[PDB]
Every structure is written in C-alpha cells, then in structure tokens.
Design an enzyme around this catalytic site. Sequence first.
Site, PDB file in Angstrom:
ATOM      1  CB  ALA B  15      -0.955   0.007   1.437  1.00 37.04           C
ATOM      2  CG  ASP B 123       0.626  -8.210  12.277  1.00 36.76           C
ATOM      3  OD1 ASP B 123       0.227  -6.937  12.500  1.00 36.76           O
ATOM      4  OD2 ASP B 123       1.523  -8.730  11.965  1.00 36.76           O
TER       5      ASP B 123
END
Lengths: 96, 298, 131, 65, 8, 39, 281
Positions: B15, B123
């Site tokens: 990204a 995560d």
Amino acid sequence: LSTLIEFLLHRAYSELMVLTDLLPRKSDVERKIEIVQFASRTRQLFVRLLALVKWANNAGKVEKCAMISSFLDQQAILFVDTADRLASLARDALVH
Amino acid sequence: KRYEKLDFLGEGQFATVYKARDKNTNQIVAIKKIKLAKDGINRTALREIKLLQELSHPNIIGLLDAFGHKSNISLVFDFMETDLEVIIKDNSLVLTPSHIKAYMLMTLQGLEYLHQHWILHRDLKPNNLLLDENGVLKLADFGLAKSFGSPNRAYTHQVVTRWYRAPELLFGARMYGVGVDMWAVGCILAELLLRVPFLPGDSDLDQLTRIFETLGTPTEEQWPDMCSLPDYVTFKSFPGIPLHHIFSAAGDDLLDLIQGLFLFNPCARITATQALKMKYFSNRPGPTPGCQLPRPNC
Amino acid sequence: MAEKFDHLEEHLEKFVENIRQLGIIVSDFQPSSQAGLNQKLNFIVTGLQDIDKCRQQLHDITVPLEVFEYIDQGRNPQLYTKECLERALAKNEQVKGKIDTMKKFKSLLIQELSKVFPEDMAKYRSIRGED
Amino acid sequence: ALYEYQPLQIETYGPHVPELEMLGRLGYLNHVRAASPQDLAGGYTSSLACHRALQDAFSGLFWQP
Amino acid sequence: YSPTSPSY
Amino acid sequence: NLITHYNLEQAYNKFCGEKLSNFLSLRSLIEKPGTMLAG
Amino acid sequence: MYHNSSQKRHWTFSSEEQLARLRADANRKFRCKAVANGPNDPVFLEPHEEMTLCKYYEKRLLEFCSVFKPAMPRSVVGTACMYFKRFYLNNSVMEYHPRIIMLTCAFLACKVDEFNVSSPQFVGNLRESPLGQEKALEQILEYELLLIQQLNFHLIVHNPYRPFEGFLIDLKTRYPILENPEILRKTADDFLNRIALTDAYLLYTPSQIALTAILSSASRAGITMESYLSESLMLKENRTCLSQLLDIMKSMRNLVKKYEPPRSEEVAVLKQKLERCHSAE
C-alpha cells in the site's frame, strides 16, 4: 548488498512513478528541485556504490589483514592470560 | 474528485498511504492506495475491506470510504498521527502507570469488541496500534485477520510478527483462539513497560528459546496436551525469570495481568473480557484521559 | 572478476553519468524534451533490468559491514589496512618486546644465575647446551 | 477518575445465548464434535464452535427490516 | 534485527 | 615481520608509512528499509 | 456477526416490492442511458425477463460452484449467489452479462471467503478451451472491481448454514421432545436450497431462513415444534414477537411456494435476445 541496491532501484522506480502521476500533481520548481534531489543524493549514493565498485578491489587482502590482526591479538591474550593464570595461583594457591 | 492529497505518509509492502482531506466534511483522513499478476484485487486489501466494513468501535480503525479505478483501489481510514511504536521508542516522553493503563485499556476494549465479533487480529504489535491527537488508540491493520470460530477451517501458523507470537503459533498450531491476540497484547504491555521489545527473536526457534528462558518452559501441567502440535520440539527446562524481576516497578495487580496474558496454555490465558475485569484496571491510578496522553512532537 | 566488475563500471558507471545528464537538463523543463528526459528514463528502465541482471549475479557480495560503515563513512578501505596496520605495529611491539623481556630476562637471568651458582650443573647439560 | 468495567452491551435481536463457560454443563457440547487434543493444544475448545453456531442461530430472529 | 511484516 | 610470512609487502610499499572526498537515512534503509501513459 | 453486519443494515429489504422497485429502476436506468445516447427498441429486456435470466444464471452459478474441481465449501457458494443477487438487484443484465458476472461473483466469493484458489485453477474449472479460459480470466479481472463497487464494498455475506447448525445444536440440547433432528437436516437442506433459489436472502435474516427450513422440515415430517418457539425460545410471553416470527416464517414459506423456475424455451429466447443486446451495444 545487491538486493539492497536493487530494491533501492525500486525505490526510485516506484517513488518515481508516484511522482509521475505527480508529474501532474506538483509545482514545477518542486518538480525539478526534488527530481534532482533524488537524482543527486542518488548519484551520490551511486557514488557510494561505484565507490564500492572503485575500491572494492581489496577484499582478500583486507580480510586476510583483519585476520592477521586477530591472529596477533590472540597471542597477547594468551600472554596476559597465562599471567593471570599465575596470579590465580599466587593467591589461591598460596593462601591454601 | 472528492479527496485531495496533503502529505506522503509512506508505504507498506502492499500500500501507499497519503494524508488527505475530503471536500465534503473537511475532515483529515488517510487514503491507502493498493499496488498491482492475473489474480485481481490483492487479498490483503479485500481482507481490510471485508473485515473493517462490519466493525464499528471507538478503538478499531474504521475505513470511512473505499473506492478505486482500473485494477486498483484506495481505502479511506481515519487519519492517525502516530502509532504506539513511536510512543514507545521516543525516549523524551515518559509512560507513567496511568499512561500504560490507558493504552492497555484502549487496546483490550478494541480487542474485546473484535473478539465478541469472532474476528481475530492475527497481527498485533505496537506498530499496528495507531492513535489520533485525541489519544484514542485504534487497532491498525487487518490485512491478516480472520474469523476463528469455525472448526472446518484450517488456519496458518506463520501469521503474526515473530516478536509478538504466541508459543502455540511457533509450535505450528493450525487451529487457535483468542490466545494469539492476548499473547501479542501481553508482549505489547511488556514492551510498553520496558520500552524495548520483549522477547526479540531472530527465528522461530530463537523466539521459543527466549520465551522459555524468560518465562520457564511449560511443564504439561501448565500447558497440558502441548506435545501434540505439529512443530513441537522439546526444550531444555529453563527456570524462567520471576515476573517481579522482569518488571521491577510494576504493581501486584499489573503482575497478575502479566501472568494472565503470558500463560502458556492458550485456554487458561485470559481473554480480553476477563482481562478488563481484573483489579489492575479498577485500581487507584485511573487510565489517563486521551487528552492527557503524551504525543511525540515531531 | 574485473571486466564484470568493469562492466558494472562503464555500463553502470555510464548509468551514473547519464544521471549527471538527467539532473542537469531537468533543472530546465522544455515542454517536450521530457521526451529526451524520459528517454533517459527509458535508459533508466533498460538499465534497471539489465542492471539487475548485472546485479543478481553481482553476488550482493559478502558484507564488510563495518569497513562498510567506514566507506559508509566514505573513509576508503585502504585506511583500514592502515589502521589495523598501526595496531599491527602496536602488536609487533608487544610481541617482540616480550621476546626481549625474554632475551634480557633470560639473559640477565642467566647472568645472575651465574652470578648466583650457575650450578644446576649436570642438568645444566641441558641448560647450557640449551643455550 | 477510576475505571469500572461495563460488559459491552451489544443488542442482538434474538433469544439469549448462554455463556461460553456455562455451555458444557447445560449439555450443548455433547452435540458438537469434540476438539482433537492437537486442537485443544491451541486455543480451540469445541465450545467456540458451539458458541459461534448458537450466536449466529440467534443473531437476528426478532428482527425484520 | 528489526523485521518485515509477515508475507502472504 | 610476519607479513614476511604474510606476503602483504606490496601493500607495505603502498601501505607502509581525502579518502571519501578523495576519490572524487540511506544506511537506515540498509538497517530497516506505458509508464509514459502515467506521467 | 449478523446483527451488526452491513447485510442487516443495507442489504435486507422490507418487501419484494422494494426489490422490484430497485430492479425496475436499474432496468429503466439502462434503458434511458441507451436511449439518451443516440427510444423503445424491442431489443431491451423487461424487468421480469431480466429476473428470468437472473434465475437461470443463478442456477448455472450453483452448477459451476458444485462441479468446482476443488471441493468448494458451501459458505463460498452461498456468498457467490448472494453477490449475484445483489449485483443484479442494482444493475441491469443487459449492461453486464450474467455469465461473466456469475464467474466474477464466484471469484470474489472464493477470495472474500478464505477458500484459497489460484486463478489458473479457477479458470481451469471452466469447460472452455485454454484460450477461452484465459479470456474468461481477463473478463473476470476486468469485472471484479465493478462487482465490489456495486456491492458498496459490503463483502461479508451471512449464510443460513451456520445458524442452521446452531439451531440443530440448540434443538438437540434443549428440545428433548424431538429425537434425532437429522431427518430434519436432510429435509431442511432441501428446503434451504429451495429458499436460496428465491429472493428471500434479501428479505429475511439468515437465522429466520434457517428456522423456517427447520420448522418446515418438521411440519413435513409431522413434528410439531411450537414448544420450541413458545418455550426454549421464551416466545410464550412476548406474544407479539412469536406471532411476528410466525408471520415471517409463513411469508417466506409462501415465497418459496410461489417461486416458478425459469423455463427452457423462455430462457433460450431470453439468452438469444440478451446476446443480441450485448452484441449491438
């Protein structure tokens, strides 16, 4: 290395394409000044590289050198270490 | 067309994040464009979209918008000035027990919501705990997050940052519950109390060695039925350092919270809900209000 | 090798110099010569690939990380050899000074030993005949 | 300015689901496949499957648009 | 030793 | 001496009894790092 | 969770009239778009013919997701069919061909659910030549973003299967009157397929769909399960809630009753007229 400088190249790659729909989305002075920033810090880095290239001739020696250092240093270790070894004897030995 | 770029916030491996402002609400957001073979829209982006579209909590990042054009998309989240990592690593600003309690409370409230919705943030680390100028902590990225309820689903054991990995994931557990998030939360609290990564491992074996030498190897009465995991290897019996020696300046209630979050048995490990009910969060030093939390200036 | 080194050179060298070109013109944008500019970019792409070809066989060569720092401090290697060379001095000092410590140590040693009874007599067979 | 825990009242439009601990001693877990010992080694307990199935069964029943 | 985000 | 037994002596001459500037951030990366149609 | 989902918030409509309004609005929008750009040509499709073609291509979507060479889980198939239903709720069949959108919905369902399938496998599941498979993959990738945009980026679909299993668990647990509720499992699978064929996924919660399947199987097998509604669900006291649930169930049972499957001659004619509409754009 290599992978570093090539993902580096990427950073130019993508960076640039970023800037490149920002070729339309920036003010012109910014355009030139940063493209040369990048390009210049770059070429420098690229000098840091080509410097890798341009003095990286030295490996086998320079390692062999550092090796030689370490060869040496261990003799002196050996040396002083043998001595403390004594001093241990001195105290511990004697006082028992 | 509707959002104007303001700053070049950065990139992740999938990204490019730019600060932006919408022309409709003059609210400052963070737009996240996804890069580009023959697979289509990246699955991490779709996982962000699908999971964050059905969550709405104070302490979870929310994508205010999502759109895109040919073969590529851009998400639009709340703009979050910092994360918890820059707050931890910045030596200038102190983290008092009230500040630590505030960060823990926001983290566990967000994670309690996320776990009541049977989603597992697989995560969790100080890098992925953003927070705005109002000092509201939000769970950052869900590009590897899943739904942990169904038996018929075979998960993966490799998905969480190694330093914040539970022992069962290192042992290769293909099936797990909220214990992975809670172990990462315990590691976040330990890093928040020490300001340096608790258990920084160089590999899965090294991460396990450091976990075991710091906490003691589980003795199968503490983590019964441990030996059945696919990648279990027996370890030298480490004594483990007492928790009141690792965190020499943490209260007894905080020590109980640490012990709960760091239980080897992934079922005896406390959950976000029962962590929130422990005496630590109800004791005298109240969490700091988000207005009084320290911000790393520049 | 060298001529793959030297290729990394004159080509990738040419790549730095081309950059000299790139900036020097890109101070000044003539509305089209971006054609020339971006043909240099075109040079950049044919490079970057060809390079990486010249770069995954470049070996990422084993990392003299520190002496790296040293040339990462631009301080060129030769001074390395030089500086460990200065150590090597200090160390040759230590080592052979110690041999001296001996050569007197023994010397003046045996000196007094003789000025003392030099009478480890029979075993001085080995001793003398050990000198 | 201390903190008091509130149980996060999220209103499910349906019948009440029993709690996860008070779920094996009401009899539900007899009709759910037992978690394998390997599965139990992780955080999986075969009551997560039961609790999720019961929560989706009762999520919206008392609700129409 | 600072690592990368785990990779699908 | 022992360069004597270590052959570096050429590098003695060269290298018996500037650099950066001589021969004519990023490091942190080094620690932790139709296109014509586009622009 | 469904009660917080975007499926409850946006894609759950009050009546079939609102669905017909949406589909007629989409059909009219395409018709006006075609007319205003270079006015009543019979090449266009009617909303009911569009619904017939949508039913046909949803059947073909079930067939494709059923013969998928890796065993596709049934949540993935339900998600793909839900995507088909929504996409053509707000878009016209003459703009986007339902076979490409069929495959695209299957593709996005495989990705949104975690049924990990590589694109070469996914197009290998197509009874076309490798050239045809490559072109079909190209079209799927072209249309994937369009499908996600037309879903308003609401990718989580809640299927009645997990509420079905949860009702079965609760029914074996707190409903001793019923013995062996798995006969109900077979018959309710049948009814659940039937009800997935209709537009009930946009009108009722998955929990209500599952409960209707279960109670319909009981009623067909002669079991009365009003004690499972009034008791064991505590609808004995909120009588209005019990009658509301019964009305929902009766409405959806009747909705399955009145469903008329797409024909064989009518579907042939509609496919030919649709391909003439797509060829002449």
